[PDB]
Design a protein around this nucleic acid. Structure first.
Ligand SMILES: [Mg+2]
Ligand SMILES: [Mg+2]
Ligand SMILES: [Mg+2]
Ligand SMILES: [Mg+2]
Ligand SMILES: [Mg+2]
Ligand SMILES: [Mg+2]
Ligand SMILES: [Mg+2]
Ligand SMILES: [Mg+2]
Ligand SMILES: [Mg+2]
Ligand SMILES: [Mg+2]
Ligand SMILES: [Mg+2]
Ligand SMILES: [Mg+2]
Ligand SMILES: [Mg+2]
Ligand SMILES: [Mg+2]
Ligand SMILES: [Mg+2]
Ligand SMILES: [Mg+2]
Ligand SMILES: [Mg+2]
Ligand SMILES: [Mg+2]
Ligand SMILES: [Mg+2]
Ligand SMILES: [Mg+2]
Ligand SMILES: [Mg+2]
Ligand SMILES: [Mg+2]
Ligand SMILES: [Mg+2]
Ligand SMILES: [Mg+2]
Ligand SMILES: [Mg+2]
Ligand SMILES: [Mg+2]
Ligand SMILES: [Mg+2]
Ligand SMILES: [Mg+2]
Lengths: 93, 78, 161, 121
RNA sequence: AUUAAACCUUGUACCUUUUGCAUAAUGAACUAACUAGAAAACUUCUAACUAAAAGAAUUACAGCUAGAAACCCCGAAACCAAAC
RNA sequence: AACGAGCUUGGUGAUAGCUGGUUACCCAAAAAAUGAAUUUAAGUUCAAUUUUAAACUUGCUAAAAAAACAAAAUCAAAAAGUAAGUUUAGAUUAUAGCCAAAAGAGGGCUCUUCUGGAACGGAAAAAACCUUUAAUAGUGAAUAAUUAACAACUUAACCAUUGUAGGCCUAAAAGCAGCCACCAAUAAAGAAAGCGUUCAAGCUCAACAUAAAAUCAAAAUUCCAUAAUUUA
RNA sequence: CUCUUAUCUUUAAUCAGUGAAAUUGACCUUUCAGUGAAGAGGCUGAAAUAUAAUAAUAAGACGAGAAGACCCUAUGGAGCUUA
RNA sequence: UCGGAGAAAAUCCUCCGAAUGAUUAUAACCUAGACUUACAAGUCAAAGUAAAAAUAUCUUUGACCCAGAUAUUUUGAUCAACGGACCAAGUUACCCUAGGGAUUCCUAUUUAAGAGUUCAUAUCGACAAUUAGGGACCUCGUUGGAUCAGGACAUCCCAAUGGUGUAGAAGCUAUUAAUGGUUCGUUUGCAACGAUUAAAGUCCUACGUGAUCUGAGUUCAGACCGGAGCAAUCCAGGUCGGUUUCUAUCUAUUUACGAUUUCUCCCAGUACGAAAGGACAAGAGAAAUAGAGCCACCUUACAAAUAAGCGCUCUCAACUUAAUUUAUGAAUAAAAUCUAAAUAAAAUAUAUACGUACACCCUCUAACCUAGAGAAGGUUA
């Protein structure tokens, strides 16, 4: 229940997805010392960072790719506009 | 077999999701020409990793300590 | 012989069924579209002239109800009236209304209702009309105008004398 | 005979109303796809099975980032019916080395670079 | 599962086969004991010594020597020889 | 004491391409029932698959033009998404499928080609349809498929006279046996539309007048969940 | 036989003594309709339903036993006859 | 076995040929790379060398072993079951083992040319309609009876009705209804026949039903004819003879009902009808069968005080409903209309509202009993 409504609000459809309820720490020592990070959170942090790096890599390759094609066209344009030697005519050349 | 009301809606919902999929596949960021070669280096390195592992198979080292450590099975308090 | 369709195909048919557009208000419940200009058929215009002609030609117009008497017996009345040079005219009432609405005769509209016959002549043989009326007892007379004067049956009887 | 299908090109030519409905500009197209598998490849032909593994969509409801380039799009069109394609959006820009560990992909399709788990205030 | 043995809920015995299917068809009253994979030509692994290895006869253009590693049980109608 | 050929011992642990059986745990991979030959189709050998180990390098998806055809596969530049592939050494088992959906060919079966399937959920029970990436412990959560579905609308008042029983074999056929053309009067009426016909007279419809409306609709044991038309 | 009956004996049944056989996966062993291989005590859906003996019936448990019947197979036999 | 051709890469799919010869300028050796192919076998070929001074041109098949012929080189298969055993046929019902199996015209609707003197639909009815239901060649593919029946209605009789080419009476056709009933013989492989009946229905229930019984076949061991075969034997050809047993473990079952039909009489020889002929309904009495009982008589027994039928007696009501027919009455201006309008009625077979029966509350040493297997039950001055 409530999956679609949660999606409209920008939340995860499943309350067990991304949010304070799951991602926040579940306990800490009475003295106040923070608890060791939960294994699920550590895994989830690892996967999220792995996806973040992939986003950077693909964009750079595509952005670097278009610039390569851009400068290549200039060379083709320059190659066409070239000539050498001279152009005599008439009865001798 | 008359088709149920719930059955009809669930198909329509899926069709709308696929209908949107049409829209997002209609605007390629790069053209076919621009694509050529932009990922050549990464592909080249990836295969080298594949080959290196494949051609690196060899037996493992053997140590004297493994064989001699068996004598510890008869270790005792004097 | 119909062959059963795969359920997935049957689902496809159900969702792709034609849906008609639905108006918010029924056209019948809405006010009726105004009538376009009508066309006069070649029955009213020609008959209109006939109504004009009979009024112009005949000074006296007296009205009597149609008796639904056998046409074999209408003939003898027509023949008897023809011998007295008095003619019979019958016309559709509805096309007779517009002229009777706007004409020299406008109080005869109640008379010109239902099946009727018209007593038309050029001479006021009004006394003889009763004699022709007396020939067939059951036929009544409703009234009309004699010599351009509108009067009822009882007044006509006094006028006849 | 059940065989691989070639879609007429008109399907992938959008209409002006489509841009308004989905809110995507025909210019400045998005760069990266967010693709999730939402159906099973069981009871589907083997060629559809192959592409799903090539694209990394073996697990359902787990998003994969892909390039919005024609070659990738060709594979996606093969399995269009088994997936949901959502444009990746970067409200706060690309993640940097500092923010690479603080990202989060929202259901809206937006990759935020700062994730606090605190009331917006 | 339950406070509660039974009530409530879930649940088409086993083996063998049949097309990968059991409401099929075989087999089983139950207990105890007995009751069915065995060989080294080539290959692989582990060592000795090495242009040589092997305690005689054999192999050898890195080989040769040794070790370890393997291939079921019950059942016909019959046939033949000699006795009764 | 079961002779188409006695009985006992031995050959003998006869042989059986046939039936039956073939004893601990855990992990991993996995064909297909295809082609070929066979006194071969209840079997076997080879190919093909699968598999273990090793060597080193491209494989899979895709694949423009372009040829080959006639006017969707074969081939496979560049790329891209991806991680498999080739070769050497060793090795069995297998070599009868089943059902659904497409295309054909013999004519519902029977074959050939292509795709999918083997729930612990659903379709009532349900190998084969649909939802379903493995395996776990938890008195958490979001979802998938999901046998149900919401009888029928120009014709209503009145009248019907006459040229003429009109040419015609027809006894006779006069609107209406027959055949013939197919105009007259009448404000209003067919040289007649269905009836009736010894034949005709005869029953109405259309004529005139007055008269109101307005295309199809989703058998045999004993019934078999109970029920229910509206709360967003 | 129409059309069966009566009586007596054997058997039966109760009591006393002795005491087998085929058979048997386990059973806490129901009816109806559906499903399914012509097929259901055990599956689906309805229904019925304190627990146990004794004596009877034979619809079902493809009821239990035989060296039965029919057809096909094996590079299994055997008897007989020949050209 | 192989080759050619269509379907087109399937087929018991449809055709033509070959186990070739002719023709000759005679057509070597050697050798890259390929085709085809499980294996085996089968194809194409550059370069080089050598003969000559263009290839052979038409367009296929048989392995190994083993035998031949020669001066090295050659030849041997309807081995056609054509991957080829060096050389072997029938028959078995006298049989055995190992297994695998099985056990077109109806009928109902739609249409309606023609039949019906006239007149489509009283009764029928071409051409058709219905996703409407049911039943290579010559040869040949379990069911009777007995017992007891359960069920369907697509009704044979009994009952209620519409129509008629229904005067009456006989008939024909339709609707509703499953109520109880639906015989005894002759012929004997069933197919007709005789005599009756109110009628002698059509079907489902693994021939409904062989652990209830029984006949024939399936069908054999014996034996004959007729035919086939040299014979042994054979025949989906005749005939005669010919042995399957079961003690019930489980489920299921084992204690009441309120009736059906025919005939005679009366109505009445009336109604109807020219006559001939000839009825309804209402009423009365008889039988038959079925069910339930009984023993005064009769009859048969125990040559018992009882049991039996061949003897005797008793059997009934319908709240509510289908086809159909009336009354009032709107939609629909009627002195219309039986109403999937509101209404009032009549009208099959069914059945259980409604009654009969049962109810009681339990002494029992024992004896006796018209109660009974046991137990239970009844009786006791
Ligand atoms: Mg068997
Ligand atoms: Mg003996
Ligand atoms: Mg053996
Ligand atoms: Mg065999
Ligand atoms: Mg052979
Ligand atoms: Mg490539
Ligand atoms: Mg449901
Ligand atoms: Mg005893
Ligand atoms: Mg019990
Ligand atoms: Mg019980
Ligand atoms: Mg049943
Ligand atoms: Mg049950
Ligand atoms: Mg008993
Ligand atoms: Mg029984
Ligand atoms: Mg049996
Ligand atoms: Mg064989
Ligand atoms: Mg070869
Ligand atoms: Mg050459
Ligand atoms: Mg052969
Ligand atoms: Mg052969
Ligand atoms: Mg061959
Ligand atoms: Mg004999
Ligand atoms: Mg009966
Ligand atoms: Mg009926
Ligand atoms: Mg029986
Ligand atoms: Mg005898
Ligand atoms: Mg018995
Ligand atoms: Mg009477």
């Amino acid at each position: 229940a409530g999956g679609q409504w949660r999606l409209q609000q920008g939340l995860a459809a499943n309350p067990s997805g991304y949010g304070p309820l799951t991602e926040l720490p579940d306990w800490s020592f009475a003295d106040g010392r923070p608890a060791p990070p939960m294994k699920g959170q550590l895994r989830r942090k690892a996967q999220r960072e792995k996806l973040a790096r992939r986003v950077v890599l693909l964009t750079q390759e595509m952005d670097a790719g278009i610039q390569a094609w851009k400068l290549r066209q200039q060379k083709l344009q320059e190659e066409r506009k070239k000539e050498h030697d001279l152009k005599p005519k008439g009865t001798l050349l | 077999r008359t088709v149920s009301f719930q059955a009809k809606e669930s198909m329509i919902r899926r069709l709308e999701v696929e209908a949107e999929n049409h829209y997002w596949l209609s605007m390629p960021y790069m053209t076919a020409e621009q694509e050529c070669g932009h990922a050549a280096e990464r592909r080249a390195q990836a295969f080298e990793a594949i080959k290196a592992a494949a051609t690196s198979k060899f037996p493992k080292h053997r140590y004297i300590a493994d064989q001699l450590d068996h004598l510890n099975i008869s270790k005792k308090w004097s | 012989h119909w062959r059963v369709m795969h359920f997935q195909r049957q689902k496809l048919m159900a969702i792709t069924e034609y849906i008609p557009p639905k108006p918010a208000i029924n056209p019948r419940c809405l006010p009726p579209p105004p009538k376009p200009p009508k066309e006069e058929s070649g029955l009213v215009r020609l008959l209109r002239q006939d109504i004009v002609a009979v009024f112009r030609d005949n000074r006296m117009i007296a009205v009597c109800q149609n008796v639904a008497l056998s046409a074999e017996d209408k003939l003898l009345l027509r023949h008897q009236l023809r011998k007295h040079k008095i003619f019979i005219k019958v016309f559709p009432s509805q096309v007779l209304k517009p002229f009777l609405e706007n004409s020299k005769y406008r109080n005869l509209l109640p008379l010109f209702v239902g099946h009727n016959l018209l007593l038309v002549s050029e001479e006021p043989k009004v006394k003889e009309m009763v004699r022709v009326l007396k020939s067939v007892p059951f036929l009544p007379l409703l009234g009309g105008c004699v010599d351009d004067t509108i009067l009822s049956r009882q007044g006509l009887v006094d006028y006849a004398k | 005979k059940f065989t691989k299908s070639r879609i007429p090109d008109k399907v992938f030519q959008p209409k002006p109303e489509d841009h308004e409905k989905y809110g995507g500009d025909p210019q400045n197209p998005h760069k990266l796809h967010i693709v999730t598998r939402i159906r099973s490849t069981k009871r589907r032909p083997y060629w559809e099975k192959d592409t799903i593994k090539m694209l990394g969509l073996q697990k359902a409801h787990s998003p994969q980032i892909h390039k919005n380039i024609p070659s990738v799009n060709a594979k996606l069109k093969v399995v269009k019916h088994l997936i949901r394609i959502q444009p990746l959006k970067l409200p706060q820009g690309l993640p940097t080395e500092e923010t690479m560990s603080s990202t989060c992909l929202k259901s809206t399709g937006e990759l935020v670079v700062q994730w606090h788990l605190k009331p917006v205030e």
